[PDB]
Amino acid sequence: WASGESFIELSNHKFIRMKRKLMYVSADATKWSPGDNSAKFRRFTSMLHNGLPNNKLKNCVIDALKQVYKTDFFMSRKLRNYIDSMESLDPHIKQFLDFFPDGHHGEVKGNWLQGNLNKCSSLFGVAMSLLFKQVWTNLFPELDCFFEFAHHSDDALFIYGYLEPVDDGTDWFLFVSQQIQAGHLHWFSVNTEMWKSMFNLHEHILLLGSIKISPKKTTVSPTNAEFLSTFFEGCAVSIPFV
């Protein structure tokens, strides 16, 4: 996609040249995070298409998800023994002990506590990313943008293709202003550095499904041999031999 060139169509049968550029985002989107609602999977499996003729297995999966919703967290013995002494740090320790009604076990909801739902969560993330792709394509039918991703275990790689002015002239800015004043309010976020708006919309749409791109440990870089090579090596090897 980047090799080719994009030309936009102004109303009076005119063409504006554009330069296609890419920038990649690496993130651990499907990595289990402590703040997550496992209940979001119930409607997903209610609507996901499977070749099965009936709904017995799908409904059984939904019922399992319902039962795994509420979990009884238990305080480890070492912490219980230790907490009986040195309670100088009263605020947070007091809140933590208040979480336990009887001082031995409390109720945890939503969070599924590092349970093995890797493939389910990754499939959910793929679904939400395809949703963002569809929404962005609907948003700017005129613009020739681009978006492709590929998960690997707990990682991801979102590639955003965007359009930048070639002549550095105001023709692109003039077109954007005309679109804005014509009623297309959303074009305000496209004239300068549209890839930022692409990523912001993508992250917001993911947040609509409770997925949160971590503000740390996510790197975004343009086409770079070293960045891609390190991503692919990280994909290939899981444990350092040392």
Next chain:
Amino acid sequence: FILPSKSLEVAGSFIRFITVFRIGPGLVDKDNLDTILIDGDSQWGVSKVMSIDLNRLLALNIAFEKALIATATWFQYYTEDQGQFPLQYAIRSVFANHFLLAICQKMKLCAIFDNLRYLIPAVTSLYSGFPSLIEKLFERPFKSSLEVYIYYNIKSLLVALAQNNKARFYSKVKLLGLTVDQSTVVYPSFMSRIVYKHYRSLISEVTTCFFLFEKGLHGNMNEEAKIHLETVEWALKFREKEEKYGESLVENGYMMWELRANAELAEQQLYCQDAIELAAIELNK
């Protein structure tokens, strides 16, 4: 000199000892000795009563082997990077560094190297979330001089790595089978005077240093209270959202019109039913 102490096979016990040695080149820190007994042109330093546990004792027992293994790993990685055997100077420098890191097993250094593993790529890329990773470095107090030395090295290395992003220019390279416009930009070693060609070798150096710290201190009570409090805090946040927005709405998820009329519902631990349905449709396609 081995003072009496509780038996090391009872958990939580310590063995208390004290060393006296002739002052000379080696693992000598003058300011942390108990005293230096002067003599006739010879000074004898005597340490303080130092108590170590079984984990630290066994870690000290295999310090030489661990340092040698880490040095050989660095040797292989250097040859893979450059293509030529390193000079004896770099070899001896990294052996000294690995030996000193294997000697001093402390939790602060382990955390520091763990964060540095993810700090290096965060300053190599174009944009990233490096401020949070930097803030992670200042969570526990700096107690000894080794920690300050390692912090100073990390700060210099990170600033140097981030400075390379001011000279980014577009070139033409062939990836796979297509010639594309990439954006290129030194990579100073962490424990020598050499420069690398790929920053992945820098990351490998840092990772090798991170794994010189035994997993025993990786499971200290200070690191278990952390996960307990994390789970409890997130549960309490879920309860707060539940009581503010009603249990049914949190557990079942809001609709589109609720989000458009509120816009504060778009948050972690809250999902939009319409969004899940639409994503299921998009994947069904």
Next chain:
Amino acid sequence: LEVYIYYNIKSLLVALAQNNKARFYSKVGVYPS
């Protein structure tokens, strides 16, 4: 270059003023390069 030299001077002098005073009035040290 002038700004960098001034910044180094400022840091060194602030550190010396903070430190050497306590390392002065004990009775009748460490000075960074």
Next chain:
Amino acid sequence: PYYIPDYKGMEPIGANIEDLVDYSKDWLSRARNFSFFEVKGTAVFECFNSNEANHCQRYPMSRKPRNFLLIQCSLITSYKPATTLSDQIDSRRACSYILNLIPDTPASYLIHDMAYRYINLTREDMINYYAPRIQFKQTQNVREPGTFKLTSSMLRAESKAMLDLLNNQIESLNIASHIVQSESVSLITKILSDLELNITTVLDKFFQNETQK
């Protein structure tokens, strides 16, 4: 034979993609802040300095950098692995060396007392001290091999006080100061420099040529 039960399931709801498109139009119409920060080189330095200031504010300062070297030692020559005979010879010479010095601190006093007690052990005690348990026999002082008993009579006042102390807040170094960083880098640089001074099948071929060399 078993049959999967009925359960409940869920019924679909009307989800309009165009509704999401309208919401996204409204969202993108306004101004939003990118959640990632551009790496600059000045920005990382500013972040480090700001966090240094915050760290200094959060913790009380300390002026005593605590110990890190758990076993302080020194060598000038090659080291031969210690055997039992060499252990006996070296313990004798070490006690002779210790008996010359004058202790200044309670730990040094205990050091001197224990060296004196070692030098004042009988021949049978020394034989059983270095003997294996197979040949080991109970004596008056060497209760177990490689150990000796030491009652309170031999220890002086300082050693007894230090033993009494043994038998029975949060602060960080000023990371932002030039003096602390310079002293730390100088000390660890000296330690590392002293740690590099030189001391006064088919795979074997490549091994000896490249790695062993």
Next chain:
Amino acid sequence: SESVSLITKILSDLELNITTVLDKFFQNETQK
């Protein structure tokens, strides 16, 4: 910050490695 970063980059780039009896003391200490 920008000035100190630039000058530190220059200084580090300048440090990078590139591939009678008085004479006895000189060659032993200063020349070495």
